[PDB]
Design a protein around this ligand. Structure first.
Ligand code: SF4
Lengths: 180, 353, 95, 427, 166, 117, 160
């Protein structure tokens, strides 16, 4: 059965086209077909300022976006010889690990729902919502945040970020232990 | 129907129409309750909107369902495409009248039930086959083999566990000696709550009825996230609504039958109120089942077939043989109480390792 | 008595099916119809002669199920790799 | 208590084959069949009935014949599938049940139980084998439908499903006819013969041995229980023997020709049905089973798929004992003195003449003389010059089996007054 | 019959459809994840009538295009839309869907209204889940006949009721 | 036993249920826009080939169904013993036990061979 | 009786005609299921109730379900492919059907029977002692037949 699991259907997350060559209940071979999300960053970026491109970096991996932001910032800093302040570096690692936790939350929720049960999606997404509240506090944006800069970060943290981050760091160990 | 009177045919027709429209309102508001109970399970809240309690949203939904451009897909069998939903719905609706909701006359003069046929469980088995019938038939008529495959998965799994249902239902017949629901109920009135004697059969009936789309095969399948299920994906306005309606009526019919058959169909040890205890047990099983719906994963229907075929059905026939030995030698009826209690203790102690 | 004549009529109908049908499966279906006509005659004569024809027909049903299982397995094995089931496609064995 | 042995061995080996090699499973099947045969011998003169199940002289003799045919056909088959032995065991038990009852419905159940495993045993997977299996299954299910409606009309004409009930006029005649249709199809009588040539040509030769011996034995055993009218018997015999021998004249292939010859031989055996002596028929079937098993064991040693006529030639030069035994079998199937096939033929004809059917007996004899044409074109071809032909000169198993079969044939032809005295109660 | 030709009946059926609006998401990019956030246990589009979510297109009236629509995805989305029951509406979520957004290039459709008849537009990158709820109430009151543009005109209940499909 | 009146009431039940179902179908069919289009009538999934061209489905479903017919025959035979049990005594118990064990040996063979195939 | 009895017999005959006439395998099978339903109703009317229920459960519920599974695995709905029409065979088949009906009609004609026995409903309560008892041996033979059928089909498919 050369079956065509189409793009977005049935409930194949991350729109993709699959030609599952398959007889029975096994999986002989899946022929993948991609390109349905090709936007052309590698070309569009050639026509944007280096500062402008910081708006283009989060939008490709939109779950762990600050990793894109950090990779691009670091490459430009190496190329033009920039010096990153230590506090800016600490903030950058915090944001990267926070977006990492958000992405890990979304990945595991999507997997469990994809096969398994629906319920455990909501707890992971509640913790993700706390993380997104942190991101709004600091950058004014949920994701695609334009905060990193070639020198460093756009501006400094408000007073309220550290208390809410400690709150989440205290609740998270029990939460992750619950998922486990 | 040894001891029970018969209402006039017009009164039987009236009671039948009442039970059908009551199952309509029942499945609609039970969809509301399942939405909101799932919402409570996952810390969110339900539809405090179009209600107040959301109880006008099924009305809005039905009003959408009609006028929704009921489409007859080309390249699909013109007649069978239309015909299959009616089958799946009718044979899910019927076989609920048998359930006694009270002692005779407790319907304000006439009859708690509609029909009290002498052979009940056979009627249940037969009408249970016809649900799988409608499922795979609509799968075919859809004219999409993608849906057909899910229909076949469905049919395979449901047929397996539907066979298991028979060996499950064997055991209490040996004790009661009648195939009438009221006689079984009165036997549970005298000796008490047949599940106390037949706990293994109770368990296997529960897990078999779970395969009847209740949940945790969950490779029933639904079209979502797998090789799509059967009987849907090609119906738009009214026929899809009818498919889901019948699946839910079968769900609640099983949730009602479980206490009716194994537990104390209404006939409580105390206070003997006709309807309320039966409805409460229905609600109890419904809430436990929704807990399952929320809280447990799929089975891939391969593990589900393996499990049902290798474990449930052999276990059910073994318990049937034990009960048959006991009844043939008739030694006490206390031995079955002891045996079911010990079997429950065994199947429990193996969990807490 | 009308039931026994109706059973004979159903027997004749299944015979016509067996003769007319091009497909092995539909031939087998016509045969099942013949079997059930026989079962109805048995039930009528059981109503006549005291209920033994009922157990007879029950055993008949069981036998029919077994033979259906076997024959459908054979049909699948013969026409799984092979094309259209039409029984005229097999003429190798001749007098 | 032989049926008990059969059922025990079948059910046990069903699961035993999981831990036992197919060779061990074949050894086990052989031991069980021989033990059932020994029990049949030790119970000679001990008729035993429990339910509708009844062991009498007929049951004993015909199940002895079937057990012999099954043993021979199993000896040759060396396939590494223990199911190919499970099916033979099932068929043996089914034929025993068929021969040991008068209940029509239990007879139907036994018929299905013995016939279904043969349909599967007819699959060497050769393309003709599937065609043969298909024709066989379809015509067999049709005849099962007919036999079932005959049993229903029997239950209509009388309160019981057991044969021997008094019986009405036209309706009883109709019920008897609807039973006779299925019984003759299973006995390869014309004009129900069409399946036999195709099935014998398509099925593997050892399976055809098993069939042409045990199936015909059990079929005639069950036929003896029916009170077949003389006019119907006359028609069956005439058509069967005439068409059998005539169409066998035209056959270019050994298996198909032997099938038509078996049609003619069923026509012959149907004469003893006039009186239902069953001693004459028991003897006839003893002789015919031995001869046919011999011939088909030789044909199996030649080729399992198909054996043409010329392949038989040079068989003497290849193996003299095999050529001679094949000649003896052809003569015993021709029914010529001083052979036990002739004695069975004579006993059937004596029963027929005692029944007073003269023209039918004459036509049977004329068609039997016609049969000598191809019976000699087979027996004498053994001496011709060997042409290109595959020949595997068997094991000592099949050699000794063929030789003992021919020896028993000739010995009971010379002194039938040894065994024939005990085909009745068995003194 | 489309919900028309009686003063009471049409308002009643529009009420029904407006509250029973059945979303079918067509997730393309990060707009799709910000729409998945409109269902979590802080702000759920599971009250107004959008609790259930049938992945099939034969079963939903509202088609929510959430993300950048690549030109290779345009025919697929086109046919997913055409394969919907007829009383159907289209929401265009985010800048990439509404206009070409910041990706103004050969790869992305510069207005989804090119391929599907769009009912509601909702700007933002991503548009906030509460902005999406504002859009669905907008569409609600649109199919209620309570929607007007900046020019004063009342808007028809269903777009894709005005096109010569073919 | 039970009177035929309950069976006539059963017939009434079926007639009522079927009448209500046909009423629902009439409402659903009559109330609709009725704008057939080619792409709308197209089966599924963006142009062609939701299932597309696939050869015959796995015989696993056949195996499950045949298994089911045989074991359902089994249950059909087990029911008369289930009702008439105490009167048939140890002898009836032994006969039904023999029947059950035969068909369970068949099941054990088909299981140790398995059908994942 | 005759009012609804004639109705039920006409339904049976028409369903048989459909199952033997229609060239759609699915449609024929559905006609045969309708036939089995009408036939179980007639069974109940003939005081055979358990037998009607098993006719629905096994024959309709299981047997023709497997049939439908087979014909849906192997499409085969448009049977008229590879015709070898032999058009002369259609009137001959109709003739043979009429004759096999007429001979039975002759055998049953002028035949009146005592249909007066108190079956007490063909309930399993009263059928049990016959099944396990006089028919216990036939039952055991049937069970052995079923086991043999399982092994037969299993070894029959068994690709290797
Ligand atoms: S508008 Fe922004 S959030 Fe939406 S798909 Fe485009 S990049 Fe993603």
């Amino acid at each position: 059965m050369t079956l065509n699991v189409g793009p977005q259907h049935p409930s194949t997350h991350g729109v993709l086209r699959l030609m599952v060559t398959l007889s029975g209940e096994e999986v002989l071979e899946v022929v993948p077909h991609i390109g349905y999300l090709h936007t052309g960053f590698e070309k569009t970026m050639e026509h944007r300022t280096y500062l402008q491109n910081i708006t283009y970096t989060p939008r490709m991996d939109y779950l762990h976006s600050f990793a894109h932001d950090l990779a691009y910032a670091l490459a430009v800093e190496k190329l033009l010889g920039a010096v990153v302040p230590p506090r800016a570096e600490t903030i950058r690692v915090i944001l990267n690990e926070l977006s990492r936790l958000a992405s890990h939350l979304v990945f595991l929720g999507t997997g469990l729902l994809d096969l398994g049960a629906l319920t455990p999606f909501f707890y992971a997404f509640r913790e993700r919502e706390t993380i997104l509240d942190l991101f709004e506090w600091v950058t004014g944006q949920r994701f695609h945040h334009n905060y990193i800069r070639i020198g460093g970060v756009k501006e400094d943290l408000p007073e309220e970020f550290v208390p809410e981050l400690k709150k989440l760091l205290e609740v998270l160990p029990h939460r992750i232990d619950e998922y486990e | 129907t040894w001891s029970y009177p018969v209402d006039p045919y017009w009164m039987v027709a009236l009671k039948a129409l009442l039970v059908v429209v009551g199952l309509l309102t029942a499945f609609a508001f039970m969809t509301l309750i399942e939405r909101r109970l799932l919402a409570r399970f996952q810390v969110r809240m339900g539809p405090n909107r179009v209600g107040p309690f959301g109880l006008l949203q099924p009305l809005a939904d039905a009003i959408k369902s009609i006028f929704k451009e009921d489409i007859v897909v080309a390249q699909a069998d013109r007649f069978l495409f239309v015909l299959a939903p009616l089958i799946s719905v009718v044979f899910a609706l019927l076989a609920f009248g048998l359930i006694p909701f009270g002692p005779p006359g407790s319907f304000f003069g006439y009859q708690p039930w509609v029909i009290n046929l002498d052979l009940g469980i056979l009627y249940l088995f037969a009408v249970s086959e016809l649900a799988v019938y409608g499922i795979f038939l609509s799968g075919w008529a859809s004219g999409s083999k993608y849906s057909l495959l899910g229909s076949l998965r469905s049919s395979a799994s449901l047929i397996s566990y539907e066979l298991g249902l028979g060996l499950a239902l064997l055991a209490p017949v040996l004790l009661v000696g009648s195939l009438n629901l009221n006689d079984i109920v009165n036997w549970q009135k005298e000796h008490g709550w047949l599940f106390l004697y037949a706990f293994p059969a109770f368990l296997v009936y529960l897990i078999a009825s779970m395969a009847e789309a209740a949940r945790t095969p969950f490779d029933l399948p639904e079209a979502e996230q797998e090789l799509v299920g059967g009987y849907h994906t090609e119906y738009s306005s009214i026929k899809w609504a009818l498919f889901q309606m019948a699946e839910y009526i079968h769900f609640i019919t099983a949730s009602a039958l479980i206490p009716t058959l194994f537990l104390g169909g209404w006939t409580m040890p105390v206070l003997e109120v006709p309807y309320l205890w039966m409805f409460l047990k229905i609600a109890f099983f419904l809430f436990f089942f929704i807990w399952i719906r929320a809280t447990w994963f799929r089975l891939r229907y391969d593990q589900l077939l393996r499990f049902g075929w290798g474990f449930l059905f052999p276990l059910a026939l073994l318990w049937f043989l034990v009960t048959a030995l006991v009844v043939a030698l008739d030694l006490p009826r206390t031995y079955l109480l002891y045996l079911s209690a010990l079997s429950f203790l065994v199947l429990l102690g193996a969990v807490l390792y | 008595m009308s039931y026994l004549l109706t059973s004979a009529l159903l027997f004749a109908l299944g015979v016509y099916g067996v003769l007319t049908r091009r497909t092995a499966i539909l031939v087998f279906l016509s045969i099942e119809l013949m079997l059930n006509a026989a079962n109805l005659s048995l039930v009528g004569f059981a109503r006549a002669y005291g209920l033994d024809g009922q157990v007879a027909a029950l055993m008949v049903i069981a036998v029919a199920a077994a033979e259906v299982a076997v024959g459908l397995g054979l049909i699948v094995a013969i026409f799984r790799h092979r094309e259209s089931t039409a029984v005229d496609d097999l003429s190798e064995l001749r007098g | 208590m032989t049926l008990a042995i059969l059922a025990v061995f079948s059910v046990a080996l069903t699961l035993l084959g999981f831990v036992l090699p197919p060779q061990g499973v074949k050894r086990a099947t052989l031991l069980g069949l021989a033990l059932a045969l020994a029990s049949l011998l030790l119970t000679w003169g001990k008729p035993f009935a429990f339910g509708p199940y009844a062991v009498d002289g007929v049951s004993q003799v015909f199940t002895l014949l079937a057990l012999l045919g099954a043993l021979w056909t199993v000896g040759l088959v060396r396939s590494g599938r223990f199911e190919f032995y499970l099916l033979v065991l099932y068929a043996a038990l089914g034929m025993h049940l068929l021969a040991s009852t008068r209940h029509l419905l239990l007879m139907l159940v036994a018929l299905e139980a013995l016939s279904l495993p043969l349909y599967a045993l007819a699959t060497w997977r050769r393309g003709q084998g599937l065609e043969a299996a298909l024709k066989y299954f379809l015509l067999g299910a049709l005849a099962a439908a007919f036999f079932l409606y005959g049993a229903a009309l029997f239950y209509g004409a009388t309160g019981s499903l057991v044969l021997g009930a008094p019986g009405e006029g036209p309706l009883y005649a109709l019920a008897l006819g609807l039973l006779l249709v299925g019984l003759g199809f299973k006995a390869a009588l014309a004009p129900f013969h069409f399946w036999t040539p195709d099935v014998y040509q398509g099925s593997p030769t050892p399976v055809v041995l098993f069939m042409a011996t045990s199936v015909k034995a059990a079929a005639f055993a069950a036929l003896l229980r029916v009170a077949a009218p003389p006019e119907a018997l006359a028609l069956l015999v005439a058509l069967s023997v005439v068409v059998g021998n005539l169409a066998a004249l035209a056959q270019k292939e050994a298996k198909r020709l032997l099938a038509y010859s078996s049609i003619a031989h069923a026509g012959y055996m149907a004469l003893a049905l006039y009186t239902g002596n069953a001693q004459a028929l028991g003897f006839y079937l003893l002789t015919y089973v031995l001869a046919t098993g011999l011939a088909f064991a030789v044909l199996s040693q030649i080729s399992p798929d198909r054996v043409p006529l010329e392949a038989l030639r040079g068989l003497y030069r290849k193996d003299p004992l095999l050529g001679l035994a094949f000649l003896v079998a052809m003569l015993s199937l021709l029914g010529l003195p001083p052979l036990a096939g002739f004695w069975g033929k004579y006993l059937a004809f004596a029963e027929a003449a005692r029944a007073g059917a003269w023209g039918v007996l004459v036509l049977a004899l004329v068609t039997s003389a016609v049969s000598a044409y191809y019976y000699l074109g087979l027996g004498l071809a053994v001496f011709a010059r060997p042409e290109e032909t595959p020949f595997r000169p068997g094991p000592p198993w099949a050699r000794a089996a063929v030789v003992a079969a021919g020896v028993l044939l000739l010995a009971l032809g010379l002194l039938p007054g040894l065994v024939l005295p005990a085909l009745a109660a068995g003194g | 019959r489309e919900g028309i030709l009686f003063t009471t009946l049409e308002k009643l059926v529009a009420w029904g459809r407006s509250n029973s609006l059945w979303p079918a998401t067509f997730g393309l990019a990060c707009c799709a994840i910000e729409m998945m956030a409109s269902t979590d246990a802080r702000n759920d589009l599971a009250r107004f009538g959008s609790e259930v979510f049938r992945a099939s297109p034969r079963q939903a009236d509202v088609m929510i295009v959430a993300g950048r629509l690549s030109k290779k995805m345009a025919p697929v989305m086109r046919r997913v839309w055409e394969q919907m029951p007829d009383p159907k509406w289209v929401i265009s979520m985010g800048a990439c869907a509404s206009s070409g957004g910041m990706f103004n290039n050969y790869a992305i459709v510069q207005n989804v209204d090119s391929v599907v008849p769009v009912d509601v537009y909702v700007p933002g990158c991503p548009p906030r889940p509460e902005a999406l709820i504002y859009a669905v109430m907008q569409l609600q009151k649109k199919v209620r006949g309570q929607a007007y543009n900046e020019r004063g005109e009342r808007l028809p209940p269903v777009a894709a009721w005005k096109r010569t499909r073919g | 036993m039970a009177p035929i009146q309950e069976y006539v009431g059963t017939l009434i039940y079926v007639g009522v249920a079927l009448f209500i179902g046909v009423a629902a179908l009439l409402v659903g069919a009559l109330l609709g826009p009725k704008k057939p289009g080619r792409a709308k009538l197209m089966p599924y999934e963006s142009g062609n080939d939701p299932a597309g061209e696939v050869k015959r489905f796995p015989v696993h479903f056949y195996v499950v169904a045949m298994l089911f017919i045989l074991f359902d025959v089994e249950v059909a035979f087990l029911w008369p013993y289930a009702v008439s049990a105490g009167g048939l005594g140890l002898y009836g118990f032994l006969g039904v036990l023999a029947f059950t064990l035969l068909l369970f040996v068949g099941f054990l063979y088909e299981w140790w061979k398995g059908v994942m195939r | 009786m005759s009012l609804l009895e004639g109705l039920a017999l006409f339904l049976l005959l028409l369903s048989g005609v459909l199952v033997v006439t229609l060239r759609n395998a699915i449609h024929a099978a559905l006609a045969l299921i309708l036939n089995f339903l009408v036939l179980a109703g007639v069974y109940v009317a003939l005081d055979a109730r358990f037998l009607g229920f098993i006719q629905v459960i096994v024959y309709a519920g299981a047997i023709v379900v497997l049939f439908l599974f087979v014909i849906m695995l192997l499409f085969a709905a448009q049977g008229e492919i590879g015709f070898d029409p032999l058009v002369r065979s259609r009137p001959l088949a109709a003739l043979l059907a009429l004759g096999v009906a007429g001979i039975l009609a002759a055998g049953l004609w002028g035949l009146d029977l005592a249909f007066t026995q108190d079956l007490k409903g063909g309930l399993p309560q009263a059928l049990g002692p016959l099944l396990y008892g006089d028919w216990l041996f036939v039952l055991l033979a049937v069970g052995f037949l079923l086991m043999a059928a399982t092994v037969v089909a299993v070894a029959l498919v068994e690709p290797g």
